[PDB]
Amino acid sequence: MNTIAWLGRLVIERIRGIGVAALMLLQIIFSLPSAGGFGRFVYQMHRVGVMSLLIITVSGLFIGLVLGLQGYSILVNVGSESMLGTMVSLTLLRELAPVVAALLFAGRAGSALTAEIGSMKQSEQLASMEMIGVDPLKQIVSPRLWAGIVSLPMLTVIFAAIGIVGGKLVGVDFLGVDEGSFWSGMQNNVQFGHDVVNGIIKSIVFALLCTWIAVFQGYACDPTPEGIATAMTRTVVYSSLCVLGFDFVLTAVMFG
Amino acid sequence: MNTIAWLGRLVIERIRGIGVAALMLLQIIFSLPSAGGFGRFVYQMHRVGVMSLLIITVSGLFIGLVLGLQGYSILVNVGSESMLGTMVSLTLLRELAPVVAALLFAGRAGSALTAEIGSMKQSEQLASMEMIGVDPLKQIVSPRLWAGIVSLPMLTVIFAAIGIVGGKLVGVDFLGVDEGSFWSGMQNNVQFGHDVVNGIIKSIVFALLCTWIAVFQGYACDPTPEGIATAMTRTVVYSSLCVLGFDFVLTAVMFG
Amino acid sequence: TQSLIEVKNLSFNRGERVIYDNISLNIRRGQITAIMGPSGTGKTTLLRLIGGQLVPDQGEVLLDGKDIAQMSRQELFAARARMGMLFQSGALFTDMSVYENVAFPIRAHTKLSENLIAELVALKLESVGLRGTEQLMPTELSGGMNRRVALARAIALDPDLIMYDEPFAGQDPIVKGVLTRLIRSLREALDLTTIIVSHDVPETLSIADYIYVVAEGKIQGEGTPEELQAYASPFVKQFLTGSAEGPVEYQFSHQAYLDNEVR
Amino acid sequence: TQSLIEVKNLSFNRGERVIYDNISLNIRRGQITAIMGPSGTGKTTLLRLIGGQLVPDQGEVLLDGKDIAQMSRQELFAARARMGMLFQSGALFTDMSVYENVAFPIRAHTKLSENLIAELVALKLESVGLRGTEQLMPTELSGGMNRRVALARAIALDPDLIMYDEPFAGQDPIVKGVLTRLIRSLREALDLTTIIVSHDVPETLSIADYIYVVAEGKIQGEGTPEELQAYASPFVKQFLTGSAEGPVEYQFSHQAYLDNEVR
Amino acid sequence: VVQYLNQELVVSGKIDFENAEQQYQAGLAIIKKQTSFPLIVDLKQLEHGNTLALAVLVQWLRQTPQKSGLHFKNVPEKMLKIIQACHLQEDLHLV
Amino acid sequence: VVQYLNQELVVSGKIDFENAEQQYQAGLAIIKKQTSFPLIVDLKQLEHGNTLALAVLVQWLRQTPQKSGLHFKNVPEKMLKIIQACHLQEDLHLV
Numbered sequence A, B: 001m002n003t004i005a006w007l008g009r010l011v012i013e014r015i016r017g018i019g020v021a022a023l024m025l026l027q028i029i030f031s032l033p034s035a036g037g038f039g040r041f042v043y044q045m046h047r048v049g050v051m052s053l054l055i056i057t058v059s060g061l062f063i064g065l066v067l068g069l070q071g072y073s074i075l076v077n078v079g080s081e082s083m084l085g086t087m088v089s090l091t092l093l094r095e096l097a098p099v100v101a102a103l104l105f106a107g108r109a110g111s112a113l114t115a116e117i118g119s120m121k122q123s124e125q126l127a128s129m130e131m132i133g134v135d136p137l138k139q140i141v142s143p144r145l146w147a148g149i150v151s152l153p154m155l156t157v158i159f160a161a162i163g164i165v166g167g168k169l170v171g172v173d174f175l176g177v178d179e180g181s182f183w184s185g186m187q188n189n190v191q192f193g194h195d196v197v198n199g200i201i202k203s204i205v206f207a208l209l210c211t212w213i214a215v216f217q218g219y220a221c222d223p224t225p226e227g228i229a230t231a232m233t234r235t236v237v238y239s240s241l242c243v244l245g246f247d248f249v250l251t252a253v254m255f256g
Numbered sequence C, D: 001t002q003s004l005i006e007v008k009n010l011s012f013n014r015g016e017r018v019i020y021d022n023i024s025l026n027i028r029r030g031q032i033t034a035i036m037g038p039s040g041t042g043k044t045t046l047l048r049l050i051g052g053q054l055v056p057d058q059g060e061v062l063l064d065g066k067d068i069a070q071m072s073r074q075e076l077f078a079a080r081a082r083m084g085m086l087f088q089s090g091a092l093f094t095d096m097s098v099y100e101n102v103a104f105p106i107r108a109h110t111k112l113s114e115n116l117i118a119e120l121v122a123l124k125l126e127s128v129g130l131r132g133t134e135q136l137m138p139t140e141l142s143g144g145m146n147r148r149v150a151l152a153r154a155i156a157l158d159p160d161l162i163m164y165d166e167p168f169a170g171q172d173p174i175v176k177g178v179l180t181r182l183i184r185s186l187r188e189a190l191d192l193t194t195i196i197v198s199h200d201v202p203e204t205l206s207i208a209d210y211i212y213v214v215a216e217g218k219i220q221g222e223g224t225p226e227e228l229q230a231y232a233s234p235f236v237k238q239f240l241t242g243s244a245e246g247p248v249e250y251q252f253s254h255q256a257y258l259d260n261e262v263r
Numbered sequence E, F: 001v002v003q004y005l006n007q008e009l010v011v012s013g014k015i016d017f018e019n020a021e022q023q024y025q026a027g028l029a030i031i032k033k034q035t036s037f038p039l040i041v042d043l044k045q046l047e048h049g050n051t052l053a054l055a056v057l058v059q060w061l062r063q064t065p066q067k068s069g070l071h072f073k074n075v076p077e078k079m080l081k082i083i084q085a086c087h088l089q090e091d092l093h094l095v
């Protein structure tokens, strides 16, 4: 009864907020940014994207080295080492390069959008900005949000490119697989307009829900540096619940 | 010319910084904790583990639903729907439940060990503790580190258990696969002492390098709340480089 | 004696104590008024209301008829481009150096040419007490150097209203003597409007034009410093010299000890 | 006139300016000595050295012969369990309420029984000026209430040496009159040892026993307040009354403007 | 430190928080055979009043008899300075 | 605001940062045909000296030849208060 009603109130308040973040989101994009916006916009790419680049190559190199390592050894027993190039491509492209690219991005830059705005909340460096007079929704939010949208499809292609080229390195350089059957296994089965293009349309709505939460949950948080970490998980928790919760609608609309 | 010697020597204060963190690490474990240590130790489990529990079930439920969904449809064409239970088990157990369990753990609690200690650095919370006189290496580090070691193998088993039980839900409830050939596919091919035990020994050294970095990089950081986010990535970057960099030695010592 | 800020009657409870109940203030144009008083009033929480951050609950703030929180968000940033405010423990933009903190509101509101933009950039730092500590990181500075740099960007644009919030908190008695000149020397020269919140009775009475000592929710004494000390109510007499006589919470619990258990 | 802290000659450069060069101080047992001076000296950076946080470069700090940073890390926490220190802008243990901030160093150093542990818990808050604002979050508090709560935990354990660091920064003139009693009333009653760093010349001279004024790296005036004002060197005379005459950096750049280009 | 006999329980020399446990429950062991409590506690032998001098003295009475039956003499000329520091009135016996 | 002719370039009434661009380069257009610079700038007509009064006046002499050739009269009794606020000495012509 007591704790139950407590949790109820909790859920209600949470849902109420969420809605808010919607009311924030229109107010950022439905205004034309001024001069000086692009200069911070480049620096946010310098902050979010270029710093995120060194990570996803290594985890890109890894997963191809694993996925072409183990399925083949069971698959070679019947007749197929030529379908190695298909199974590495069609599971990275339509399944993992949307999903696992974001969970490394929600890791690095899904935090550093919150704690950089959890920065300006504790020392009132948000409040001073309003008091001098800017609006941080134009100043420190909108160049942050517009880099977050752009830079993730700019990475998840980069990710899967080394993802496939990684699995080539285990195949032809150590397992001795035929090069021609490797690539022409892919060429026949991986169309462009149905897989790589629809691997992007997954990665855009995986970029919006990951970066809009990580902006809002750093803005409307109380400046307590304990709860700056409980606000930190609600970036990651609500991202990973929704970046996985909206794969299953996006897999069904594309195919099935 | 001075940039290449500014980018030069950047390893050196980093390798001297890493050499400090080793010298810290002996000084935490080579002392017997006092009374009152277990009470904070339970609360850190309440902080790190119990809070992390709600995430890895959903991403546990997901990956089994995917991996048994797509490989079968190519595998069914020859003779094999009975080896569905093997390929889901032996890639989760010896390959992914060490790796992908940490990258969600380095996401949530790999941050909240830094920002909770990046808390006490900015308001001199740390410095007041020394001044009153405790040692935070005994007080706020050692119950944090000992929860981080314990709680990750306590999760990655939990992860892969729903990971396998997830893929059963797509198989027998939607693809109509035989239940007996499903499980007895696993029981012949998945030994206990070579897979599930050696899936733990991967997950311990994936827990130590993930949590010791996330303690140190929040302790010896400058209190600037911009660089509290650049210190935040170096948790995630150096974790994900080493949690992936030490899969490849651990795969080779176990088998191959 | 036309005013800028015309506070109508206010009620406000953000700590559920008694704070600011049915109080009305007026800030005459071209006068240094200091909002002091004991600890029984929200710190600058009055000045947040003139900023329009916290909400007047049954209040009514009239900025020349143009009502704060009845106006638009576009006009409010046009209204908050009228004020300079040094904060309590002065909020500096960390990441940026001293050359960029004071040049922050300059660059945010340029309306001239390229050169004349850069002309006033090098002109303000000679105008304040500076232009030789430009590129130091906001890391190497103390409370005496916190508000000093923070005051530079507060006076950066010439305002129509400027607030100070305890500038005399980390200063030495020489430099606070310079600062008490530096506040007023701007005021007679540029006919602006100041509001100071502080508690240092000697120089505040010798610099203000109209005081306002509020105890918990209401005025205790208003007017010029001549009539204010001349008409000390028995809360003002106790406040002027710090007479150890007052209804403050010296001890909170006034219960017994002999019959009080100690958990 | 046996001392506790015996500073030998020191050099220290953490901002590569001139700071503390070949200076030696002595803190006699049972005396309230105030280390005043202008902004030309590291804020408490002296008191970090007695804490042993920053390193004396060619310094030599003798705590009764037991040398700081020659001792062990085990004995240093045993040495840092001798001191109470209110910080600059008082570091409170956020989240933890007022009942837990002052009970923090009490619980960290219990040596009695369960009851007598809890006995002194309810006894300190009546002993300070409190025990009716126990469970408020350190969120609703200002500079006047920051150091007030922070002073409670500074005096929590009875020390052999206790430092204060600008307690008179957010106080009203009544309550700072109580606080100037509250500092010294402990000192005669419990024969402890105080070190205050502040700049408010009236009450500091009427409360200290030996004040030291340092300009940039050296003593300007030492001793009892009688001989100190009686022997004002022409840096001490300018620092007392506050007469605007001094070698401070009023303007930094003393170059021209007519021949100075404006980027 | 040590509390004595001849019906009177005296606090003598120090209170220093490594003690007044073994002197509390054994010092109360006199009080249960001190009926109507005519026993006097001379506190001017205390000489180290530091709010721990406030502790165990009244901790007998917590469960003792009448609230003003047990007697005290007087402060040791420093403990009083704590009294108005807690704004205190007549609290204990001022013999 | 407006700078006039009869060889003398006067600052009159205001400087308010929406201007002293069109009056700078056209006000300098007199100065190139003001040889040896006997022209006087009466600044006590200024009446809004606010460090933007410091700007364009000397910005001619950045593009001019002589340093103390171009003359000025005097402050409008408020601009001087800025002078020792920048600790300043004899800077401009004090006619």
Ligand SMILES: Nc1ncnc2c1ncn2[C@@H]1O[C@H](COP(=O)(O)OP(=O)(O)O)[C@@H](O)[C@H]1O
Pocket: C014, C015, C016, C017, C038, C039, C040, C041, C042, C043, C044, C045, D139, D140, D141, D142, D143, D144, D145, D170
């Ligand atoms: N979030 C908040 N916003 C505004 N005021 C608050 C908030 N939380 C608490 N307060 C109130 O502000 C008061 C702070 O004390 P204050 O009057 O500012 O001290 P001082 O007068 O010394 O500045 C508290 O009494 C509290 O009730």
Ligand SMILES: Nc1ncnc2c1ncn2[C@@H]1O[C@H](COP(=O)(O)OP(=O)(O)O)[C@@H](O)[C@H]1O
Pocket: C139, C140, C141, C142, C143, C144, C145, C170, D014, D015, D016, D017, D038, D039, D040, D041, D042, D043, D044, D045
């Ligand atoms: N990390 C640091 N630790 C100690 N001192 C520093 C550090 N960084 C800068 N400083 C020095 O501390 C000084 C701070 O000024 P300070 O003398 O504290 O002002 P005030 O005397 O008003 O307290 C600066 O001059 C700077 O050189």
Ligand code: VO4
Pocket: C142, C143, C144, C170, C171, C172, D037, D038, D039, D043, D199
């Ligand atoms: O500390 V000071 O702040 O001024 O000296």
Ligand code: VO4
Pocket: C037, C038, C039, C043, C199, D142, D143, D144, D170, D171, D172
């Ligand atoms: O009143 V204050 O005392 O601090 O603000």
